[PDB]
RNA sequence: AGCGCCGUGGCGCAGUGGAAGCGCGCAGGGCUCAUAACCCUGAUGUCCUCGGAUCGAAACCGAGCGGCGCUACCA
Ligand SMILES: Nc1nc2c(ncn2[C@@H]2O[C@H](COP(=O)(O)OP(=O)(O)CP(=O)(O)O)[C@@H](O)[C@H]2O)c(=O)[nH]1
Ligand SMILES: [Mg+2]
């Protein structure tokens with residue numbers, strides 16, 4: 168049972184609103200924005216991202232319009248984070 | 263010569279994977295907009 | 311622990327009740343405000359005009375309380391073709407102690423002669439100022455004929471303008487102009503939406519309303535802020551109805567006539583035929599007083615085409631079986647009020663759209679059907695009811711020979727063809743017959759943008775008559 | 781002369797202020813609960829009570845815009861299907877636009893009632909006569 | 915308002931007269947390297963409500979309810 172990862176100073180939690188083609192996604196960041204994210208390396212074709220699943224995405228200082236996914240939460244670290252309260256708790260996502 | 267408008271990071275091709283750091287520049291001579299890549303490790307934060 | 315109905319019945323018996331009309335009263339001494347006339351009939355016709363989808367049946371239902379039905383599946387919501395009706399009795403308090411603005415109170419036709427004052431702390435009883443009829447008119451662009459027919463029937467007018475929407479709505483202007491055509495110079499203005507508007511937005515709307523009504527024939531029309539749904543400021547409207555509209559000159563000297571506008575068949579389904587009723591012509595009587603047991607004929611009547619294609623008119627003779635007005639069966643009917651003449655006319659002759667816009671004459675007179683009617687016409691400079699997106703208003707073009715125009719002679723809905731056009735005169739040949747009695751106020755409209763658009767006015771001065779076959 | 785007009789306007793404004801000194805931003809945040817091939821709307825009772833509409837009619841409209849069927853448990857709606865909160869939010873907004881919100885006046889007091897057999901929703905804040913059934 | 919209908923297992927149809935029906939659904943396992951297609955097997959219903967005839971009614975019918983298509987708002 169691998170430990171979860173918390174957020175650090177520019178890497179923030181988000182939810183896939185719906186996944187884009189050609190290796191992109193649209194992530195509603197839990198800041199109020201419907202940002203566009205790129206599926207990074209280390210994560211492209213080994214950990215499949217499903218529409219509607221809480222994830223971690225790194226912002227870029229020099230583009231706030233687009234960001235890149237980093238780590239994925241398999242709805243278990245996600246529910247535990249919602250219990251702890253790392254995200255605005257109005258947008259509750261669960262199975 | 264040109265003037266920097268915004269700082270776009272352009273996504274790499276297939277066999278590689280990186281976010282190559284670049285910049286939109288409007289050329290002073292005519293005004294056409296061109297994307298230019300900026301070669302070095304810690305060079306982007308020098309573009310200003 | 312008395313039931314509400316028992317209380318209402320006791321208040322009705324204490325309030326004077328509903329008297330029964332004398333079977334033979336002295337007629338030359340009958341004024342439109344007499345008790346035999348006022349407590350049971352509506353003597354002044356009051357209409358409502360406005361743009362589509364703002365609420366006119368709403369205002370009338372708030373005022374009187376008699377619903378306009380709004381029938382026919384699709385027509386429960388979108389638009390109606392027939393006019394809406396409602397009887398309103400205007401009551402004012404006798405007590406000078408209660409302030410005048412809330413003294414007036416409009417009630418249903420079933421109300422007593424003197425209902426109590428519902429204002430708290432006021433023991434005085436109400437007095438019936440006048441009984442009025444309400445002619446609701448569907449304000450749509452597609453529907454032109456019934457608006458003009460009712461406006462002919464009308465005697466005073468109420469224009470409705472919405473608050474939040476655009477100020478110079480063209481349908482309101484068209485209806486006001488049509489009212490000005492048919493000799494109606496008594497209109498009161500109502501701002502339907504004020505609750506959703508600000509104190510300065512309402513003032514700007516009022517300034518726009520005043521700016522609109524400067525070049526119109528009606529000049530000093532009172533303006534009233536009213537609420538259709540909130541059910542407030544009706545007593546003041548009753549006051550304005552009383553003050554700014556007097557009784558049009560109408561006595562019993564004029565010869566009897568009638569104008570059917572709607573046609574009602576009394577055939578209740580499910581009941582056996584051995585117990586039936588006669589066919590009803592819903593008519594406005596602007597002249598003539600009708601009694602029980604009077605023989606009367608529909609002049610344009612049966613319209614037929616011979617084998618050669620010629621037009622024959624068989625007048626529809628009829629014995630008056632009943633004259634239903636307001637709420638109760640009444641002996642005499644006051645001219646200038648919508649009344650159902652239930653005669654022994656065939657029920658199928660009155661199914662839905664058969665007796666609409668048809669003149670009728672009591673025995674002792676012979677109105678004439680015309681095939682050719684030569685008219686004195688006049689036009690305006692720009693059309694009304696058309697929204698031009700920032701350009702000049704559509705300018706009326708002169709008449710062309712051999713053209714179909716909707717000519718509404720009073721109520722009669724006819725589509726005429728032009729034989730010739732002159733400087734002030736024109737000649738029209740009609741397909742559907744129309745009869746003329748004295749002059750009849752006529753409205754003209756043409757087909758340019760799909761549907762009918764009003765153009766001006768006209769009056770018949772001569773024509774070719776067809777002697778009816780008896 | 782418009783002098784006998786603005787006076788009644790002032791009286792009407794005074795009556796409006798006295799009767800309704802308050803004179804919707806109360807739509808619940810839609811919690812779409814997606815269990816794989818299953819969908820759960822557990823807050824449906826809260827939306828139904830915060831828009832003054834019975835849950836039966838809301839569920840019927842849901843199964844009219846969405847071509848599926850579902851079960852009600854306890855307050856909660858379970859529909860075995862994969863669907864986004866985007867479309868749920870859009871359908872809720874459209875329902876509010878044509879059912880919860882009155883078209884003639886900006887109000888929520890209106891409720892579903894019946895006048896011969898057609899469904900006639902009627903207003904309470906003003907008392908209008910509208911119909912939204914299809 | 916009357917007429918022509920209907921009343922479901924989650925949805926759709928069906929016989930109405932011997933009395934819980936089938937597909938679409940969904941759960942489960944089966945084929946498959948694997949998914950879909952396809953196999954097979956389940957747990958759920960006042961066949962709307964009150965009655966009357968019947969050895970028997972969900973069914974034949976009436977006296978009523980709700981939803982409808984017309985006729986047509988039928989003073
Ligand atoms: N907010 C508000 N709504 C009103 C007001 N008056 C009427 N309405 C509403 O506007 C809508 C139109 O009502 P309606 O009487 O049917 O309009 P109509 O005159 O019959 C249509 P037409 O003009 O073609 O004849 C109704 O929903 C009514 O309740 C009002 O004063 N304020
Ligand atoms: Mg990449």
Ligand SMILES: [Mg+2]
Nearest residue numbers: 378390394446
């Ligand atoms: Mg009407």
